[PDB]
Amino acid sequence: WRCARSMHEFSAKDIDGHMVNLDKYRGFVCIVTNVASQCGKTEVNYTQLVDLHARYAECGLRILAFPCNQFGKQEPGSNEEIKEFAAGYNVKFDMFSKICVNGDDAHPLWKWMKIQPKGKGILGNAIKWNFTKFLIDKNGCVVKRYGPMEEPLVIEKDLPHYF
Numbered sequence: 002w003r004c005a006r007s008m009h010e011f012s013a014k015d016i017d018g019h020m021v022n023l024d025k026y027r028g029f030v031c032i033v034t035n036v037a038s039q040c041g042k043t044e045v046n047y048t049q050l051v052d053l054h055a056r057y058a059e060c061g062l063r064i065l066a067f068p069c070n071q072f073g074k075q076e077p078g079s080n081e082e083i084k085e086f087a088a089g090y091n092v093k094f095d096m097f098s099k100i101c102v103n104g105d106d107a108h109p110l111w112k113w114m115k116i117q118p119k120g121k122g123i124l125g126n127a128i129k130w131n132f133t134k135f136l137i138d139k140n141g142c143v144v145k146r147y148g149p150m151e152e153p154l155v156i157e158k159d160l161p162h163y164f
């Protein structure tokens with residue numbers, strides 16, 4: 002994974018258990034984010050992500066949400082329960098099966114994103130908490146990273162430069 006050159010070289014199981022080849026996102030600007038149902042910022046992140054997708058899907062914005070239980074055990078539920086939880090926020094973007102984002106068992110896409118030049122956060126490579134966001138350009142390269150404290154709407158400053 003270390004020498005992969007694009008998010009499009011990876012695959013991941015979606016929240017229904019179906020393996021997805023991420024080269025389907027070639028030509029689309031993507032937000033990749035680790036999510037959780039029981040986080041103090043769950044509501045702000047889900048609602049603003051849904052708002053961004055509603056406003057920009059016509060522009061080519063796609064959103065990939067990876068549930069993760071590594072931060073305060075705040076995603077303890079099953080994939081089926083998390084799918085129903087996201088439905089409650091009217092999520093129409095792409096939900097994936099629960100993964101790890103840190104450590105040796107982290108999904109290889111996340112290992113790769115964290116070492117990209119724009120994938121290093123202001124506080125370093127490790128994912129620090131729920132709802133870190135990566136902006137991915139149409140070629141599958143990481144172009145921005147946003148921390149758990151940065152609400153999704155801050156990403157609006159960067160989107161028009163990559164569509």
Ligand SMILES: *CC(=O)N1[C@@H](c2ccc(C(=O)OC)cc2)c2[nH]c3ccccc3c2C[C@@H]1C(=O)OC
Binds near residue numbers: 060160161162
């Ligand atoms: C995808 C897209 O259409 N973009 C531009 C845009 C045109 C018209 C509408 C609209 O009718 O609203 C419902 C919405 C978006 C666009 N314009 C624009 C101006 C300032 C900042 C961003 C911005 C966009 C996003 C998108 C685009 O072409 O960005 C390069």
